[PDB]
């Protein structure tokens, strides 16, 4: 007694698989916070090999946004991924307004995609808009450096910002909890709207530890091993789930229906 409405999701899935997939992930952070190692570990553990050095050599004379188009064949699904990362940021002699190239790249990608998909003769084209930016934070232990506060309060209406506690494996749970409370009190002295997962803030923000060496991929210290697989504060699974497994389509949806649309009603405003 059914006509076949249930088959619509099956058609949607089978159609989307054939068309291929793309992604563009921004990683922003001062050097030495494990960005390259984390990004290499996340995706199949193959990128930034000594054949292609990348920002591991922190060239600080100039900042030059360097993406990397890579192709991954997950069994039968094609993912064309880019990791937009800025070599050299917030570490040189001066760092005032040291974020203009980043917002430059983001707005340029928005504008170029809008050009691609707004002409009369438009067709199917690649997509190069960034979907989410992971902003690393060093574990100072007292609050947030004013550069991070300016980065939040400035570039937050344009791209999904996810604050990470870079190298969380150098903190104590009591001071880590007080650090979390302090940062989410300065988040309400300076009102900031981070990307909130749909529906609790106590076990936020995400803190991550990354590595490449196998030992369980974990780092070795004289007093043993620092691991990545846990749930207390070295949470290398909550990010890999609430970024890839669960909400990544929601990331695209919120970039489009909010961010990309905010720009589209900004450049078309007058």
């Amino acid at each position: 007694g059914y006509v076949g409405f249930a088959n619509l999701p099956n058609q949607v899935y089978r159609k989307s698989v054939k068309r291929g997939f793309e992604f563009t992930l921004m990683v922003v952070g001062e050097s030495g916070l494990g960005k390259s190692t984390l990004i290499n570990s996340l995706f199949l553990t193959d990128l930034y090999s000594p054949e292609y050095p990348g920002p591991s050599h922190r060239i600080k004379k100039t900042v030059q946004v360097e993406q990397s188009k890579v192709l991954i064949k997950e069994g039968g699904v094609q993912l064309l991924l880019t990791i937009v990362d800025t070599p050299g940021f917030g570490d040189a002699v001066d760092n005032s307004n040291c974020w203009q190239p980043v917002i430059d790249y983001i707005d340029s990608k928005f504008e170029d995609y809008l050009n691609a998909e707004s002409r009369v003769n438009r067709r199917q084209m690649p997509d190069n808009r960034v979907q989410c930016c992971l902003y690393f934070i060093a574990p100072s232990g007292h609050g947030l450096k004013p550069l991070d506060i300016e980065f939040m309060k400035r570039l937050h209406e344009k791209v999904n910002i996810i604050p990470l506690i870079a190298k969380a494996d150098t903190l104590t749970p009591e001071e880590c909890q007080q650090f979390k409370k302090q940062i989410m009190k300065e988040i309400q002295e300076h009102k900031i709207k981070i990307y909130e997962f749909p529906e609790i803030k106590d076990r936020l923000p995400l803190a991550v530890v990354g590595s490449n060496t196998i030992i369980v991929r974990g780092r070795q210290y004289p007093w043993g091993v620092a691991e990545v697989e846990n749930g207390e504060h070295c949470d290398f699974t909550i990010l890999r789930n609430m970024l890839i497994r669960t909400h990544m389509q929601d990331l695209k949806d919120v970039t489009n229906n909010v961010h990309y649309e905010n720009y589209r009603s900004r450049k078309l405003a007058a």
């Binding site: 249930a6 999701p9 989307s16 002409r119 497994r245 489009n256």
Partner: protein, 287 residues
């Protein structure tokens, strides 16, 4: 990465929005449009029989809202009334081409708006067009060939022979040939099923060999024991709607059992919503 769950991430969010579909049934009064469609959705709808004294073709455009295990479809059924029943044929397709044009128009003029919303919109475009053909038995009639002459470039038209219990099979096949040649006489490329996605293309390919279908519909359920199935009753026999030798109601119910519904949306948005824009939208700019 081990996370291939990207294709599932958007399936689970569309059902939250709900689905929207549309259907255009074109055929002169009396062929059994409302009856066939009520049987197709196995539901009783609001379409009462019309009158032969309708001076001008009108569009019912009756909307509904059905349900299934998870999906909440918002149907929008549009059917011609008083079509092809007077002495006028070269001016018959106008009120059934202006309809598809005006259904393009609203979505278009909302696509170019400044503070536009697209996550939740009720697309009113016509997504498919069944075409009932009278079961005459020599070749396609005048109005039929003229209508498929200048309609195939707007919707994924599908030719089906209605009231197909008054044509012998030993003759029917010849009719098929004697119509398909006319299809390639004017050379009209009626909807070709994809036959490109190697996962499922051969079903579409064999569907295209029997592309001129045959259908019948009635809201009376007669034979029992097996089940309460719907059929046809005459003092000399009974007609089974899904016997695969009387009528092809199942073969037409392959756009509804959804071998290809999303393909119809894609071809509407990329091969009929484009020729209306790649060429016809050149009024302003880029010349």
């Amino acid at each position: 990465v081990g996370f291939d769950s990207l294709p599932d991430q958007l399936v689970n969010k569309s059902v939250s929005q709900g689905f929207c579909f549309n259907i255009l049934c074109v055929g002169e009064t009396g062929l059994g449009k409302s009856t066939l469609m009520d049987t197709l959705f196995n539901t009783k709808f609001e379409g009462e029989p019309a009158t032969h004294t309708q001076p001008g073709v009108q569009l019912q455009s009756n909307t509904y809202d059905l349900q299934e295990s998870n999906v909440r479809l918002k149907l929008t059924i549009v059917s011609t009334v008083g079509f092809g029943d007077q002495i006028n044929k070269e001016d018959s397709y106008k009120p059934i081409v202006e309809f598809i044009d005006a259904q393009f128009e609203a979505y278009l003029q909302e696509e170019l708006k400044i503070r536009r919303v697209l996550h939740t919109y009720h697309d009113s475009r016509i997504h498919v067009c069944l075409y009932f053909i009278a079961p005459t038995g020599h070749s396609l009639k005048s109005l039929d060939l003229v209508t498929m002459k200048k309609l195939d470039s707007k919707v994924n038209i599908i030719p089906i022979i209605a009231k197909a219990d008054a044509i012998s099979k030993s003759e029917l096949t010849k009719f098929k040939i004697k119509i398909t040649s006319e299809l390639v006489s004017n050379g009209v490329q009626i909807y070709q099923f994809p036959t490109d996605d190697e996962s499922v293309a051969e079903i579409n390919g064999t569907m295209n060999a029997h592309l001129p279908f045959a259908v019948i519909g009635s809201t009376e359920e007669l034979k029992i024991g097996n089940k309460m199935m719907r059929a046809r009753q005459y003092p000399w026999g009974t007609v089974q709607v899904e016997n695969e030798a009387h009528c092809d109601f199942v073969k037409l119910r392959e756009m509804l059992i959804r071998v290809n519904m999303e393909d119809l949306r894609e071809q509407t948005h990329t091969r009929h919503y484009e020729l209306y824009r790649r060429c016809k939208l050149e009024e302003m700019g880029f010349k």
